Structure formats: structure tokens, C-alpha cells
């Protein structure tokens, strides 16, 4: 129900390390990576470009294993 996920606050280019201004928290469906993990995502890279408003799903962040 009120599960918030990490949403791309801007376009995240491929092979670019995540910084805190790149991601917001939002209740979206389907649910993606929990918003609690944003500190943890800082500096991991994405393996595809993530357009603005896309929910970051587990399979897009290299090294993400929760």
C-alpha cells in the first residue's frame, strides 16, 4: 500500500554513479527499490539510462544486492 520507492529525479545517464540529487522518494506501482535504501545507493552505478520519473528497480543498479 504506502510503500515508497526510489524514483529518478532526473535522467540518470548509463555508467554514472548515483548522487543524492538524482533520486526522490514516491509511492509508485509496481513497487521498486525501497526509499530507505537511498543512502546506500549513493555511488552505485546504473546499467541502463534511467529516464525522469522511472522507478529504480533492483536489476538496474550494479552491485545492488539486498
From Swiss-Prot:
One cellular component term from this protein's GO annotations in UniProt: extracellular region
Gene3D superfamilies for this protein: Antifreeze-like/N-acetylneuraminic acid synthase C-terminal domain (3.90.1210.10)
Location in the cell: Secreted
Keyword annotations of the record: Antifreeze protein, Secreted
CDD domains named among the record's database cross-references: Antifreeze_III
Source organism, top-level taxon: Eukaryota
Assigned protein family: Belongs to the type-III AFP family.
Tissue: Detected in blood serum (at protein level).
Stated name of the protein: Type-3 ice-structuring protein HPLC 12
Domain AFP-like positions: 5-64
Native organism: Zoarces americanus
Entry-linked InterPro entries: AFP_Neu5c_C, AFP_Neu5c_C_sf, Antifreeze_III
Cited function: Contributes to protect fish blood from freezing at subzero sea water temperatures. Lowers the blood freezing point. Binds to nascent ice crystals and prevents further growth.
Record site: Important for ice-binding: 10, 15, 19, 45
